[PDB]
Paper text:
The polysaccharides in red algae (Rhodophyta) are primarily mixed galactan agars such as agarose and carrageenan. Carrageenans are high molecular weight polymers having a linear backbone of repeating D-galactopyranose units (G) linked together by alternating α-1,3 and β-1,4 linkages. Detailed analysis of the enzyme activities encoded by the CarPUL, combined with interpretation of growth phenotypes, have allowed us to propose a refined and detailed model of κ- and ι-carrageenan processing by some Pseudoalteromonas species.
The first step in processing the free DA monosaccharide that would result from complete depolymerization of carrageenan is performed by a 3,6-anhydro-d-galactose dehydrogenase, which is putatively encoded by the dauA gene (locus tag EU509_08920 in PS47) in the CarPUL of Pseudoalteromonas sp.33.
Residue numbers in the entry:
A (entry chain E), B (entry chain A): 1 to 475
The structure:
């Protein structure tokens, strides 16, 4: 049941080609999917377009019931969905719960949110007209998803698009498409109307470019890198479209003099090694003060040494391997470039001895400065990069010394210090003394980290168009 | 006082080039401006960027005081501002009040709006963290403005950008730059901080493309045509930017059998001949039922024949000329092409004899059908294009048979017909039995009419970025 077909137009159809999924830990074939071509891409766009007139006029409560029906099928098929993520990217068995649960959480949140949307009246200052502001479905939506959270990233778009009445064309990453294809099988099982949801994977220069260049979609959304976001914006300029982009980050983490070093180490290591550091909001530059530098490093090394690395559903594995060889080499060249410029390797910086798979050990780097490539670029790996600072006003300028604008962290027990950083940090998210994300809390970045919001009620703004109906009262 | 210079970096500077302004009625040189080049365009972008650190950190109340101080200078120079609009495009003196008053209304609305912005807390469903959602200035904003309302189009962007703390680079139309250059003189007069507002006019291939392709602006906004919107989106893809575009329209106006014909003729003729029909929300296709066809045309003709056409500050002129020869020729070709395919010319259709200037007479055309070019394309002139329908469901499909999604009009006395069209009309605005626009009422389009809103509190959304501050409660 791991040889899955395309879900286009409410039907499970096969392809002209085929792509196999290879597990990055065992490097064996774990499944195959029917790969889409330009013809299959146009088939999904046309079926999504034809379904707009009926799906957008379907009452919100009826759409919400279709979402809850898919949610019931997702809960019933929990083991298969988590196993799909487990096999396609060697994600630890317990961390696959985050992917699966977010899909249930998203379907629940936006089924309930859409039935609470109400029109609003605008006051006429002249007393000559009445005005009613309503919200309606925009059109077809197309989504390109990163591979780091296959089902979570899918949930961020599937939930809102279904609730807002927008037929959706999903393109999962060719590296992790099995779990999304399984969701399409669930929509075919419950009998979801044709064209509402379409799931296909294919080559970027053909399938992906064709979906963006098409004049059918009204909204293009991407969870990925900044460079691909620029390409999608330019490629989609064949028509006027909405863009919702959640792109790369370079999160600073500031551990101050008065910070709880045990809490800062627990939080930082927890998210630096979960998903092998392949997380958009994880710290990329760990700023540590002089007076607590040596004490904070000893705490991070102890936690890093206690990270269970491997690939086994039966075992309590904490961290798996990175996605593929390109990721492994990119991370390794950043660690090795830092050492040649004076950085000190305290732990890791290599693959375990004689191990099969693209595993990278929990790495701890010190003596990092602003001129190194590991400082300017997004690591997206299990590398804790530590920079020593002394002054708060200087570490703030260094923290803002990046084109990214996603997440950021400040660890301190001083209210004047917390207020100072929370205000002047140029990032969409400021985490204070911890980390927290949820389906109801908005996730977003500013500057080059994208435009648009995932989670919370604001995620519906990309899929709903306003309409003002103004009526003359005199005649 | 009709030779004005660039307003860049808080100073009025000259250039090596000059653009002469010709009145489209008298065809005489009425003024001259210092034309900007690529070097001057980079001077404005650099000064706007350097101003962001200080202008964005200026308190909202203090920024609103600068807006009200500019408003006072605007009110003091009301005659000169309306004079520049009157001379650059031959706009009737009575109609120059709309441009002027909207600039005062916009500065008033958004100065009061920015001081009432408040943070919002978000509930944590787990009780482990606190969350505060705030809004902050995004960055530098650049605006390209259409010529049809020089000061009103400037008002829509200047008001929000100043209030939201975003240094603004404005490029007015090369055809109508005098009025905006005078606003920059008022800015230099009151001592507005340097880089907050920059006003330069230049060539599209050089000045306009260098502004979009620059990686400095965070927001690119355009009041113009759809094809230019697509060009700005692609050209701005050198970095991740926000796009706020209010583009072309093709408004249908449905006069049903039960409509007040006197009210429909008053509303349609008023906005069809105001500004010589060079209004984006004006009806482009007038649908009239068979039973009221002969009676509605007679009412429209008597109102069209009563339009005073000319160019005189001391006379109550209702309508002036179109913008230039290209506009005149484009409109004339649509009328002549329509007559070749069966349209009946009832009035106008030509320039008045002997008169100087690009005047086009109030024009009434009947027997228009869906195949004609004047039906598929935006007229943007003083031409009332009349199509006759019989079935309400058919005219609704014809009304929606367009790529545009701006304004739309329904004239009826039946509540079931009004509700039917108000729901199924796929347009941003549905005007019932009249027309209403104001600084507090949102103005926007859907589909290819662009993305983003002008006027209302929603206009601040393009210039304000969110920020979530989450704090662990246990620590
Ligand atoms: N802001 C957030 O919430 C968030 C969340 C997760 C990740 N991220 C960011 O994502 C990045 C890592 O993800 P990644 O390296 O997989 O991103 P990526 O290389 O930019 O790819 C992202 C997705 O876009 C697809 N794609 C690539 N080129 C395309 C084209 N020309 N047309 C259409 N689609 C195309 C890819 O499919 P293929 O895989 O088939 O090429 C992939 O599924 C990091 O920078 C991280 O910061 C951000
Ligand atoms: N939705 C609305 O609220 C609204 C309001 C007003 C008008 N409109 C639309 O605007 C259209 C008529 O205006 P128009 O004929 O002036 O439209 P246009 O030809 O697209 O010009 C719009 C503005 O953009 C500038 N521009 C042109 N090319 C550019 C480039 N490459 N880079 C930067 N800027 C550039 C033009 O400057 P130059 O004049 O110097 O070339 C002009 O000021 C109509 O279709 C109407 O529907 C819409």
């Amino acid at each position: 049941s791991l040889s899955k077909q395309l879900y286009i137009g409410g039907k499970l159809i096969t392809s002209d080609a085929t792509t196999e999924i290879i597990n990055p830990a065992t490097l064996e074939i774990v499944g195959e999917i029917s790969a889409a071509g330009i013809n299959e891409a146009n088939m999904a766009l046309e079926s999504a377009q034809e379904a707009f007139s009926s799906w957008s006029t379907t009452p919100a409560i009826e759409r919400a019931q279709w979402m809850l029906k898919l949610r019931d099928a997702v809960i019933a098929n929990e083991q298969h969905l988590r196993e799909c993520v487990h096999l396609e990217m060697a994600k630890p068995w317990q961390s696959t719960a985050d992917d699966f649960q977010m899909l249930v959480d998203s379907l629940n949140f936006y089924a309930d949110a859409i039935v609470n949307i109400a029109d609003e009246e605008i006051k006429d200052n002249e007393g000559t007209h009445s005005h009613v502001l309503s919200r309606e479905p925009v059109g077809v939506a197309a989504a390109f998803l990163a591979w780091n959270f296959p089902l979570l990233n899918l949930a961020y778009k599937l939930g809102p698009a279904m609730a807002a009445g927008c037929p959706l064309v999903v393109k999962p990453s060719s590296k992790t498409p099995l779990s999304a294809y399984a969701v399409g099988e669930l929509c075919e099982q419950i009998g979801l109307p044709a064209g509402v949801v379409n799931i296909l994977s294919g080559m970027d220069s053909t399938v992906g470019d064709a979906i963006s260049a098409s004049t059918i979609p009204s909204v293009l959304t991407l969870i990925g890198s900044t460079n691909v976001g620029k390409h999608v914006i330019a490629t989609g300029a064949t028509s006027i479209k909405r863009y919702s982009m959640e792109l790369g980050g370079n999160a600073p983490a500031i551990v101050c003099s008065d910070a709880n070093l045990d809490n800062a180490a627990d939080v930082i290591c927890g998210v630096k090694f979960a998903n092998a550091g392949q997380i958009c909001v994880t710290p990329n530059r760990v700023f540590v003060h002089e007076s607590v530098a040596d004490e904070f490093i000893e705490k991070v090394l102890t936690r890093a040494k206690a990270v269970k690395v491997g690939f086994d559903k039966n075992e309590a594995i904490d961290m798996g391997p990175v996605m593929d060889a390109n990721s492994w080499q990119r991370i390794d060249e950043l660690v090795k470039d830092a050492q040649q410029n004076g950085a000190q390797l305290q732990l890791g910086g290599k693959k375990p001895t004689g191990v099969n798979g693209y595993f990278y050990e929990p790495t701890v780097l010190t003596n990092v400065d602003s001129s190194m490539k590991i400082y300017k670029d997004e690591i997206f790996g299990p590398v804790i990069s530590i920079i020593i600072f002394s002054d708060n006003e200087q570490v703030l300028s260094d923290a803002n010394d990046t084109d990214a604008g996603l997440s950021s962290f400040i660890f301190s027990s001083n209210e004047d210090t917390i207020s100072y950083f929370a205000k002047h940090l140029r990032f969409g998210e400021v985490q204070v003394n911890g980390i927290k994300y949820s389906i109801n809390l908005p996730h977003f970045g500013i500057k080059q980290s994208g435009v648009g919001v995932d989670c919370s009620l604001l995620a519906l703004d990309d899929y709903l168009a306003y309409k003002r109906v103004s009526r003359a009262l005199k005649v």
